[PDB]
Amino acid sequence: FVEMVDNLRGKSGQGYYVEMTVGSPPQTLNILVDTGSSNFAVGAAPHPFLHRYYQRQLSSTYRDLRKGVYVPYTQGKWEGELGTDLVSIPHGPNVTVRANIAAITESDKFFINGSNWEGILGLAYAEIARPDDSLEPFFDSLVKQTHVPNLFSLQLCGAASVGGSMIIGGIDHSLYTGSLWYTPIRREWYYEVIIVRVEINGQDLKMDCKEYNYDKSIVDSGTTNLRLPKKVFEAAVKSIKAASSTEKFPDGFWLGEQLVCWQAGTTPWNIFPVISLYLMGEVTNQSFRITILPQQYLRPVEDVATSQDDCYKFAISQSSTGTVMGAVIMEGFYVVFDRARKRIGFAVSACHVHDEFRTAAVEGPFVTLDMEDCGYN
Numbered sequence: 001f002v003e004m005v006d007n008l009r010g011k012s013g014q015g016y017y018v019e020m021t022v023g024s025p026p027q028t029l030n031i032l033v034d035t036g037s038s039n040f041a042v043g044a045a046p047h048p049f050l051h052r053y054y055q056r057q058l059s060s061t062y063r064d065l066r067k068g069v070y071v072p073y074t075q076g077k078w079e080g081e082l083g084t085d086l087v088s089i090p091h092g093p094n095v096t097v098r099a100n101i102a103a104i105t106e107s108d109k110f111f112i113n114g115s116n117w118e119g120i121l122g123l124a125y126a127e128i129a130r131p132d133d134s135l136e137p138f139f140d141s142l143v144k145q146t147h148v149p150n151l152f153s154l155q156l157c158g159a160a161s162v163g164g165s166m167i168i169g170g171i172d173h174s175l176y177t178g179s180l181w182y183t184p185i186r187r188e189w190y191y192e193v194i195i196v197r198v199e200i201n202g203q204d205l206k207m208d209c210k211e212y213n214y215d216k217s218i219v220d221s222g223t224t225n226l227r228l229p230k231k232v233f234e235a236a237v238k239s240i241k242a243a244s245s246t247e248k249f250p251d252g253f254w255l256g257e258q259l260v261c262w263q264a265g266t267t268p269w270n271i272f273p274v275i276s277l278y279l280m281g282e283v284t285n286q287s288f289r290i291t292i293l294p295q296q297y298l299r300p301v302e303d304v305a306t307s308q309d310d311c312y313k314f315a316i317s318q319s320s321t322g323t324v325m326g327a328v329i330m331e332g333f334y335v336v337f338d339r340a341r342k343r344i345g346f347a348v349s350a351c352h353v354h355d356e357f358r359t360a361a362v363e364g365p366f367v368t369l370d371m372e373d374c375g376y377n
Protein backbone atom coordinates (compact mmCIF):
# COMPACT_ATOMS: atom_id res chain seq x y z
CA PHE A 1 0.00 0.00 0.00
CA VAL A 2 3.03 2.30 0.13
CA GLU A 3 2.31 3.16 -3.53
CA MET A 4 -0.76 5.12 -2.25
CA VAL A 5 1.11 6.92 0.61
CA ASP A 6 1.24 10.72 0.11
CA ASN A 7 -1.24 10.65 -2.83
CA LEU A 8 -3.34 13.59 -1.46
CA ARG A 9 -2.41 17.26 -1.83
CA GLY A 10 -4.10 20.59 -1.21
CA LYS A 11 -4.03 24.07 0.27
CA SER A 12 -5.24 25.11 3.71
CA GLY A 13 -9.03 25.64 3.67
CA GLN A 14 -9.42 24.44 0.04
CA GLY A 15 -9.80 20.68 0.89
CA TYR A 16 -7.76 17.60 -0.12
CA TYR A 17 -7.55 16.23 -3.64
CA VAL A 18 -6.31 13.00 -5.29
CA GLU A 19 -5.13 12.55 -8.90
CA MET A 20 -7.57 10.67 -11.13
CA THR A 21 -7.93 9.83 -14.82
CA VAL A 22 -11.07 9.75 -16.89
CA GLY A 23 -11.78 8.31 -20.37
CA SER A 24 -9.63 6.69 -23.08
CA PRO A 25 -7.01 7.95 -23.52
CA PRO A 26 -6.73 9.00 -19.86
CA GLN A 27 -7.36 12.66 -19.11
CA THR A 28 -5.71 13.56 -15.76
CA LEU A 29 -7.74 15.61 -13.26
CA ASN A 30 -7.34 16.56 -9.61
CA ILE A 31 -10.44 15.59 -7.70
CA LEU A 32 -11.39 16.64 -4.23
CA VAL A 33 -11.95 13.69 -1.83
CA ASP A 34 -15.31 14.22 -0.15
CA THR A 35 -16.80 11.73 2.33
CA GLY A 36 -19.74 14.18 2.83
CA SER A 37 -21.34 13.62 -0.61
CA SER A 38 -21.87 10.80 -3.12
CA ASN A 39 -21.46 12.11 -6.69
CA PHE A 40 -18.43 11.92 -8.90
CA ALA A 41 -18.67 15.36 -10.56
CA VAL A 42 -16.05 17.14 -12.71
CA GLY A 43 -15.66 20.36 -14.66
CA ALA A 44 -16.46 19.64 -18.31
CA ALA A 45 -16.24 23.22 -19.56
CA PRO A 46 -13.55 25.93 -19.63
CA HIS A 47 -14.39 27.92 -16.54
CA PRO A 48 -11.52 30.46 -16.19
CA PHE A 49 -10.58 29.33 -12.68
CA LEU A 50 -10.06 25.71 -13.76
CA HIS A 51 -6.63 24.42 -14.73
CA ARG A 52 -8.12 21.52 -16.76
CA TYR A 53 -11.44 19.83 -17.52
CA TYR A 54 -13.19 16.71 -18.88
CA GLN A 55 -13.29 16.82 -22.65
CA ARG A 56 -15.72 14.03 -23.61
CA GLN A 57 -15.21 14.56 -27.35
CA LEU A 58 -11.68 13.17 -26.70
CA SER A 59 -12.85 9.87 -25.12
CA SER A 60 -13.66 6.72 -27.04
CA THR A 61 -15.07 5.03 -23.96
CA TYR A 62 -17.53 7.88 -23.06
CA ARG A 63 -21.29 7.16 -22.91
CA ASP A 64 -24.14 9.58 -22.41
CA LEU A 65 -26.92 8.70 -19.96
CA ARG A 66 -29.13 11.37 -21.50
CA LYS A 67 -30.11 12.94 -18.22
CA GLY A 68 -29.08 16.02 -16.28
CA VAL A 69 -28.41 16.74 -12.59
CA TYR A 70 -28.92 19.98 -10.70
CA VAL A 71 -27.22 20.18 -7.26
CA PRO A 72 -28.01 23.24 -5.11
CA TYR A 73 -26.40 23.86 -1.75
CA THR A 74 -26.08 26.84 0.66
CA GLN A 75 -25.04 29.90 -1.34
CA GLY A 76 -24.03 27.86 -4.44
CA LYS A 77 -24.76 25.19 -7.00
CA TRP A 78 -23.32 22.97 -9.71
CA GLU A 79 -25.23 21.48 -12.57
CA GLY A 80 -24.43 18.98 -15.28
CA GLU A 81 -24.89 16.11 -17.66
CA LEU A 82 -24.67 12.48 -16.55
CA GLY A 83 -22.70 9.81 -18.38
CA THR A 84 -20.29 6.98 -17.66
CA ASP A 85 -16.68 6.40 -18.73
CA LEU A 86 -13.46 4.60 -17.67
CA VAL A 87 -11.78 5.84 -14.47
CA SER A 88 -8.50 5.07 -12.76
CA ILE A 89 -6.55 6.39 -9.75
CA PRO A 90 -2.84 6.50 -10.78
CA HIS A 91 -1.59 6.39 -7.16
CA GLY A 92 -4.43 3.96 -6.20
CA PRO A 93 -5.10 0.33 -6.99
CA ASN A 94 -4.20 -0.99 -10.41
CA VAL A 95 -7.74 -1.17 -11.78
CA THR A 96 -9.96 0.71 -14.22
CA VAL A 97 -13.68 0.87 -13.54
CA ARG A 98 -16.68 2.18 -15.47
CA ALA A 99 -18.28 4.82 -13.25
CA ASN A 100 -20.89 7.50 -13.37
CA ILE A 101 -19.46 10.96 -14.17
CA ALA A 102 -21.45 14.19 -13.87
CA ALA A 103 -20.01 16.61 -16.45
CA ILE A 104 -20.37 20.01 -14.77
CA THR A 105 -21.52 22.47 -17.48
CA GLU A 106 -22.59 25.26 -15.09
CA SER A 107 -21.80 26.19 -11.49
CA ASP A 108 -21.96 29.00 -8.90
CA LYS A 109 -19.56 29.35 -5.91
CA PHE A 110 -18.32 25.77 -6.42
CA PHE A 111 -14.86 25.99 -7.93
CA ILE A 112 -12.36 28.03 -5.87
CA ASN A 113 -10.32 30.73 -7.57
CA GLY A 114 -6.71 29.70 -7.18
CA SER A 115 -7.44 26.08 -6.31
CA ASN A 116 -5.80 23.28 -8.19
CA TRP A 117 -8.74 20.84 -8.24
CA GLU A 118 -11.35 20.42 -11.00
CA GLY A 119 -13.81 17.86 -9.57
CA ILE A 120 -15.34 16.24 -6.47
CA LEU A 121 -15.31 12.52 -5.54
CA GLY A 122 -18.31 11.71 -3.36
CA LEU A 123 -17.26 8.73 -1.21
CA ALA A 124 -20.54 8.59 0.84
CA TYR A 125 -23.46 6.29 -0.08
CA ALA A 126 -26.13 6.13 -2.79
CA GLU A 127 -28.94 7.16 -0.45
CA ILE A 128 -27.79 10.82 -0.87
CA ALA A 129 -26.57 10.51 -4.48
CA ARG A 130 -28.14 12.89 -6.94
CA PRO A 131 -30.50 13.02 -8.63
CA ASP A 132 -31.64 9.90 -6.71
CA ASP A 133 -30.27 6.76 -5.03
CA SER A 134 -30.00 4.78 -8.31
CA LEU A 135 -26.97 6.76 -9.49
CA GLU A 136 -24.28 4.31 -8.36
CA PRO A 137 -21.45 6.07 -6.49
CA PHE A 138 -17.86 5.62 -7.70
CA PHE A 139 -16.72 3.58 -4.78
CA ASP A 140 -19.66 1.14 -5.10
CA SER A 141 -18.77 0.72 -8.82
CA LEU A 142 -15.09 0.24 -7.92
CA VAL A 143 -15.84 -2.47 -5.37
CA LYS A 144 -18.57 -4.15 -7.47
CA GLN A 145 -16.28 -4.40 -10.58
CA THR A 146 -13.00 -5.32 -8.91
CA HIS A 147 -11.62 -7.42 -6.08
CA VAL A 148 -10.78 -4.20 -4.20
CA PRO A 149 -11.96 -4.77 -0.59
CA ASN A 150 -14.87 -2.58 0.49
CA LEU A 151 -12.91 -0.11 2.59
CA PHE A 152 -10.75 3.00 2.27
CA SER A 153 -8.75 5.02 4.85
CA LEU A 154 -7.68 8.61 5.11
CA GLN A 155 -4.62 10.30 6.65
CA LEU A 156 -5.11 14.04 6.39
CA CYS A 157 -1.92 15.82 7.54
CA GLY A 158 -1.73 19.42 6.25
CA ALA A 159 1.45 21.53 6.55
CA ALA A 160 0.56 26.66 2.83
CA SER A 161 0.49 23.39 0.94
CA VAL A 162 -1.12 20.35 2.66
CA GLY A 163 -0.74 16.59 2.13
CA GLY A 164 -2.06 13.16 3.05
CA SER A 165 -2.89 9.61 1.97
CA MET A 166 -6.00 7.88 0.72
CA ILE A 167 -5.45 4.13 0.97
CA ILE A 168 -8.05 2.49 -1.22
CA GLY A 169 -8.84 -1.12 -0.19
CA GLY A 170 -6.86 -1.27 3.00
CA ILE A 171 -5.10 -0.03 6.09
CA ASP A 172 -1.38 1.03 6.23
CA HIS A 173 -0.06 0.67 9.82
CA SER A 174 2.74 3.10 9.18
CA LEU A 175 0.15 5.91 9.16
CA TYR A 176 -1.02 5.35 12.75
CA THR A 177 0.26 4.59 16.21
CA GLY A 178 -1.45 2.64 18.97
CA SER A 179 -4.73 1.04 18.19
CA LEU A 180 -7.75 1.60 16.01
CA TRP A 181 -11.04 2.00 17.82
CA TYR A 182 -14.27 1.66 15.90
CA THR A 183 -17.60 3.39 16.09
CA PRO A 184 -20.63 2.02 14.16
CA ILE A 185 -21.95 3.65 11.00
CA ARG A 186 -25.54 4.19 12.10
CA ARG A 187 -26.96 4.43 8.57
CA GLU A 188 -25.38 4.19 5.12
CA TRP A 189 -26.16 7.57 3.64
CA TYR A 190 -23.60 10.00 5.06
CA TYR A 191 -20.95 8.45 7.21
CA GLU A 192 -23.17 8.86 10.26
CA VAL A 193 -22.03 8.19 13.81
CA ILE A 194 -23.19 8.92 17.38
CA ILE A 195 -21.34 11.16 19.84
CA VAL A 196 -22.29 9.97 23.33
CA ARG A 197 -20.38 12.38 25.50
CA VAL A 198 -18.29 15.53 25.11
CA GLU A 199 -15.60 16.93 27.36
CA ILE A 200 -13.68 20.17 27.23
CA ASN A 201 -10.38 19.90 29.08
CA GLY A 202 -11.75 16.90 31.01
CA GLN A 203 -14.90 18.50 32.37
CA ASP A 204 -17.96 17.65 30.35
CA LEU A 205 -20.99 19.55 29.17
CA LYS A 206 -23.59 17.37 30.91
CA MET A 207 -25.91 17.91 27.91
CA ASP A 208 -28.51 15.36 26.89
CA CYS A 209 -26.16 13.49 24.56
CA LYS A 210 -29.10 13.56 22.04
CA GLU A 211 -28.24 17.21 21.39
CA TYR A 212 -24.69 16.26 20.26
CA ASN A 213 -26.38 14.45 17.35
CA TYR A 214 -29.32 16.86 16.47
CA ASP A 215 -30.24 15.84 13.79
CA LYS A 216 -27.00 14.15 12.70
CA SER A 217 -23.35 13.62 13.32
CA ILE A 218 -21.12 12.93 10.32
CA VAL A 219 -17.53 12.43 9.33
CA ASP A 220 -16.76 14.67 6.41
CA SER A 221 -13.42 15.33 4.72
CA GLY A 222 -15.07 18.12 2.62
CA THR A 223 -15.67 20.45 5.57
CA THR A 224 -12.80 22.24 7.31
CA ASN A 225 -14.29 22.75 10.73
CA LEU A 226 -15.61 20.86 13.66
CA ARG A 227 -19.16 22.01 13.30
CA LEU A 228 -21.50 21.61 16.31
CA PRO A 229 -25.26 22.14 16.76
CA LYS A 230 -26.21 25.52 18.24
CA LYS A 231 -26.96 24.57 21.89
CA VAL A 232 -23.89 22.31 21.80
CA PHE A 233 -21.87 25.10 20.17
CA GLU A 234 -22.78 27.73 22.80
CA ALA A 235 -22.29 25.25 25.64
CA ALA A 236 -18.98 24.26 24.01
CA VAL A 237 -17.69 27.77 23.34
CA LYS A 238 -18.94 28.98 26.76
CA SER A 239 -16.76 26.30 28.31
CA ILE A 240 -13.78 27.02 26.00
CA LYS A 241 -14.26 30.73 26.69
CA ALA A 242 -14.02 29.99 30.46
CA ALA A 243 -11.02 27.57 30.30
CA SER A 244 -9.25 30.19 28.16
CA SER A 245 -9.89 33.20 30.41
CA THR A 246 -6.10 33.87 30.68
CA GLU A 247 -6.62 36.32 27.75
CA LYS A 248 -9.53 38.29 26.22
CA PHE A 249 -10.77 38.00 22.60
CA PRO A 250 -13.52 39.59 20.51
CA ASP A 251 -16.94 37.97 21.01
CA GLY A 252 -17.45 37.73 17.19
CA PHE A 253 -14.17 35.82 16.88
CA TRP A 254 -15.80 32.68 18.35
CA LEU A 255 -18.58 33.18 15.76
CA GLY A 256 -16.05 33.17 12.83
CA GLU A 257 -16.94 36.75 11.86
CA GLN A 258 -13.44 37.91 12.79
CA LEU A 259 -9.88 36.53 12.93
CA VAL A 260 -7.63 36.80 15.96
CA CYS A 261 -3.80 36.97 16.09
CA TRP A 262 -0.59 36.90 18.09
CA GLN A 263 2.93 38.11 17.23
CA ALA A 264 5.04 35.73 15.10
CA GLY A 265 6.10 32.66 17.13
CA THR A 266 4.05 33.83 20.15
CA THR A 267 0.85 31.69 20.14
CA PRO A 268 -0.25 30.57 23.64
CA TRP A 269 -1.12 26.88 23.18
CA ASN A 270 -1.72 25.92 26.78
CA ILE A 271 -4.40 28.53 27.48
CA PHE A 272 -6.57 26.27 25.26
CA PRO A 273 -8.29 23.07 26.40
CA VAL A 274 -8.09 19.67 24.67
CA ILE A 275 -11.54 18.64 23.31
CA SER A 276 -12.69 15.03 23.66
CA LEU A 277 -15.56 13.43 21.80
CA TYR A 278 -16.71 10.07 23.17
CA LEU A 279 -18.07 7.99 20.28
CA MET A 280 -20.34 4.95 20.50
CA GLY A 281 -18.23 1.78 20.51
CA GLU A 282 -18.75 -1.72 19.08
CA VAL A 283 -20.13 -3.35 22.23
CA THR A 284 -23.21 -2.49 24.34
CA ASN A 285 -22.44 0.15 27.02
CA GLN A 286 -18.84 0.57 25.68
CA SER A 287 -17.44 3.76 24.21
CA PHE A 288 -14.06 5.18 23.31
CA ARG A 289 -12.91 8.75 22.99
CA ILE A 290 -11.01 10.96 20.58
CA THR A 291 -9.19 14.05 21.86
CA ILE A 292 -7.90 16.91 19.69
CA LEU A 293 -5.48 19.72 20.57
CA PRO A 294 -5.90 23.49 19.95
CA GLN A 295 -3.58 23.22 16.90
CA GLN A 296 -6.58 21.33 15.38
CA TYR A 297 -9.37 23.85 16.21
CA LEU A 298 -7.08 26.91 15.82
CA ARG A 299 -5.91 26.90 12.15
CA PRO A 300 -3.70 29.67 10.56
CA VAL A 301 -5.24 31.96 7.89
CA GLU A 302 -2.76 31.41 5.01
CA ASP A 303 -2.41 34.99 3.83
CA VAL A 304 -4.03 38.22 5.01
CA ALA A 305 -3.45 41.01 2.42
CA THR A 306 -3.74 43.54 5.28
CA SER A 307 -1.52 41.78 7.96
CA GLN A 308 1.88 40.18 8.92
CA ASP A 309 1.33 38.09 12.14
CA ASP A 310 0.31 34.55 13.22
CA CYS A 311 -3.45 34.94 12.60
CA TYR A 312 -5.49 31.85 13.30
CA LYS A 313 -9.19 31.29 12.86
CA PHE A 314 -11.36 29.39 15.34
CA ALA A 315 -12.32 26.23 13.46
CA ILE A 316 -15.42 25.35 15.56
CA SER A 317 -18.76 26.69 14.37
CA GLN A 318 -22.56 26.45 14.64
CA SER A 319 -24.79 24.25 12.47
CA SER A 320 -28.29 23.32 11.46
CA THR A 321 -27.51 19.99 9.72
CA GLY A 322 -25.83 18.39 12.75
CA THR A 323 -22.30 17.80 13.96
CA VAL A 324 -19.75 17.62 11.14
CA MET A 325 -16.36 16.20 11.95
CA GLY A 326 -14.18 17.79 9.29
CA ALA A 327 -10.49 18.41 8.83
CA VAL A 328 -10.32 19.80 12.40
CA ILE A 329 -11.08 16.33 13.76
CA MET A 330 -9.73 14.16 10.95
CA GLU A 331 -6.26 15.81 10.91
CA GLY A 332 -5.56 14.43 14.39
CA PHE A 333 -6.34 10.83 13.38
CA TYR A 334 -5.93 8.08 10.78
CA VAL A 335 -9.53 7.38 9.79
CA VAL A 336 -10.77 4.03 8.47
CA PHE A 337 -13.99 3.86 6.53
CA ASP A 338 -14.83 0.21 7.00
CA ARG A 339 -17.74 -0.04 4.65
CA ALA A 340 -17.66 -3.88 4.74
CA ARG A 341 -18.41 -3.80 8.50
CA LYS A 342 -20.60 -0.70 8.84
CA ARG A 343 -18.00 1.05 11.00
CA ILE A 344 -15.43 3.84 11.18
CA GLY A 345 -12.10 3.40 12.89
CA PHE A 346 -10.03 6.04 14.61
CA ALA A 347 -6.32 5.81 15.57
CA VAL A 348 -3.81 8.52 16.55
CA SER A 349 -2.35 9.78 13.27
CA ALA A 350 1.33 9.23 12.57
CA CYS A 351 1.37 12.85 11.38
CA HIS A 352 -0.81 15.00 13.63
CA VAL A 353 0.93 18.25 14.66
CA HIS A 354 1.98 17.70 18.33
CA ASP A 355 4.16 19.55 20.88
CA GLU A 356 6.20 18.39 23.94
CA PHE A 357 3.25 18.82 26.33
CA ARG A 358 0.13 17.13 24.89
CA THR A 359 -0.91 14.80 22.01
CA ALA A 360 -4.02 13.83 20.03
CA ALA A 361 -5.36 10.62 21.61
CA VAL A 362 -7.70 7.75 20.96
CA GLU A 363 -8.60 5.97 24.25
CA GLY A 364 -10.96 3.31 25.62
CA PRO A 365 -12.93 1.43 26.56
CA PHE A 366 -15.24 3.48 28.71
CA VAL A 367 -18.60 2.51 30.19
CA THR A 368 -21.39 4.69 28.78
CA LEU A 369 -25.04 3.78 29.31
CA ASP A 370 -28.00 4.51 27.02
CA MET A 371 -25.84 5.26 23.96
CA GLU A 372 -28.86 4.62 21.63
CA ASP A 373 -30.83 7.39 23.29
CA CYS A 374 -28.17 9.74 21.83
CA GLY A 375 -29.40 9.04 18.28
CA TYR A 376 -32.07 11.38 16.83
CA ASN A 377 -35.23 10.04 15.01
Ligand SMILES: Nc1ccc2ccccc2n1
Residues within 6 Å of the ligand: 034, 035, 036, 037, 073, 120, 220, 221, 222, 223
Ligand atom coordinates in the same frame (compact mmCIF):
# COMPACT_ATOMS: atom_id res chain seq x y z
N1 LIG B 1 -18.97 17.48 2.47
C1 LIG B 1 -19.47 18.39 1.74
C2 LIG B 1 -19.89 19.59 2.28
C3 LIG B 1 -20.43 20.56 1.46
C4 LIG B 1 -20.56 20.30 0.11
C5 LIG B 1 -21.09 21.22 -0.78
C6 LIG B 1 -21.20 20.91 -2.12
C7 LIG B 1 -20.79 19.68 -2.59
C8 LIG B 1 -20.24 18.75 -1.72
C9 LIG B 1 -20.12 19.04 -0.37
N2 LIG B 1 -19.59 18.11 0.43
